[PDB]
Amino acid sequence: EFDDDLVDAEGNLVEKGGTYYLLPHIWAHGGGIETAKTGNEPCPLTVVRSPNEVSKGEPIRISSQFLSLFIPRGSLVALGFANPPSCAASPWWTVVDSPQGPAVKLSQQKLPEKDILVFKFEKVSHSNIHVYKLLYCQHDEEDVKCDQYIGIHRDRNGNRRLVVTEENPLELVLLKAKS
């Protein structure tokens, strides 16, 4: 039988707990992931995509709920900045409801595991390099259901904000970071 682990951009299994750049499949759609200070936030707590196609963005830790060395693709994962802005209490991304829909943010406090272990990579068929969509998993009730995708919403200021999308899910390739 098969675990079907996540594969990085260079064909190597993704290491659980390892740090990767989250880059667009399409070269022209921007660079890696970073942060921005939006709305009334006191500091950069909004997770966004760099507009710089040359930027690999920040190194992101990818951790599953398991101890395994690798990550089964059906595994829930948490995603965090290896080097978060100083004002975030931890590196981990979380999803916050809003008038216009759920958005991806950092937090000024430490959150429970059930608020950060809310993502899952979904392999994109019809592709040579391993490309993944990024799902958000809301509470089913006693569990979670991964039935929404993360996409990009460009705000009035140009920020390419990561938010729950309904029509154009982003597609990433995971490139191993410095070491």
Side-chain angles (χ1 to χ4, degrees), residues 2-179:
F2 201 19
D3 271 43
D4 204 357
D5 299 329
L6 298 173
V7 185
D8 75 20
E10 300 178 307
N12 299 148
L13 295 195
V14 169
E15 302 181 346
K16 186 193 295 329
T19 56
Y20 295 80
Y21 300 112
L22 270 49
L23 310 178
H25 175 220
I26 304 294
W27 306 321
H29 293 175
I33 308 296
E34 70 195 3
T35 58
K37 181 175 75 59
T38 73
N40 290 304
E41 296 175 343
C43 61
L45 299 169
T46 298
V47 183
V48 304
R49 173 175 274 169
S50 183
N52 317 152
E53 285 97 37
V54 37
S55 180
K56 293 179 303 284
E58 292 290 322
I60 301 308
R61 296 184 191 293
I62 303 176
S63 309
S64 88
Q65 60 163 68
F66 302 129
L67 292 152
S68 65
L69 297 183
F70 306 109
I71 305 172
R73 73 209 224 308
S75 172
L76 283 166
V77 297
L79 297 170
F81 289 109
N83 309 134
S86 190
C87 69
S90 79
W92 312 115
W93 304 2
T94 196
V95 176
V96 183
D97 305 316
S98 82
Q100 226 270 275
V104 184
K105 301 292 199 178
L106 299 178
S107 172
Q108 290 189 283
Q109 59 186 326
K110 258 88 179 308
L111 292 179
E113 315 280 86
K114 77 184 142 56
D115 286 344
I116 54 169
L117 193 72
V118 292
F119 301 102
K120 174 185 307 194
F121 286 107
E122 182 187 80
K123 174 192 45 55
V124 165
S125 67
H126 194 104
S127 182
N128 296 311
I129 179 159
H130 292 78
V131 179
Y132 295 95
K133 276 175 199 175
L134 172 61
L135 286 153
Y136 165 59
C137 314
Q138 65 182 306
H139 296 285
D140 189 321
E141 59 189 33
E142 73 147 358
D143 202 359
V144 283
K145 191 168 213 339
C146 301
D147 51 5
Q148 291 179 102
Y149 286 103
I150 296 302
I152 304 214
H153 172 70
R154 218 193 211 79
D155 63 14
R156 65 168 196 157
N157 292 68
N159 297 304
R160 301 175 191 193
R161 304 158 66 153
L162 269 71
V163 303
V164 162
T165 182
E166 190 185 5
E167 319 239 337
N168 288 80
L170 63 79
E171 297 181 46
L172 299 171
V173 303
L174 315 169
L175 182 62
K176 214 305 150 198
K178 295 247 203 78
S179 201

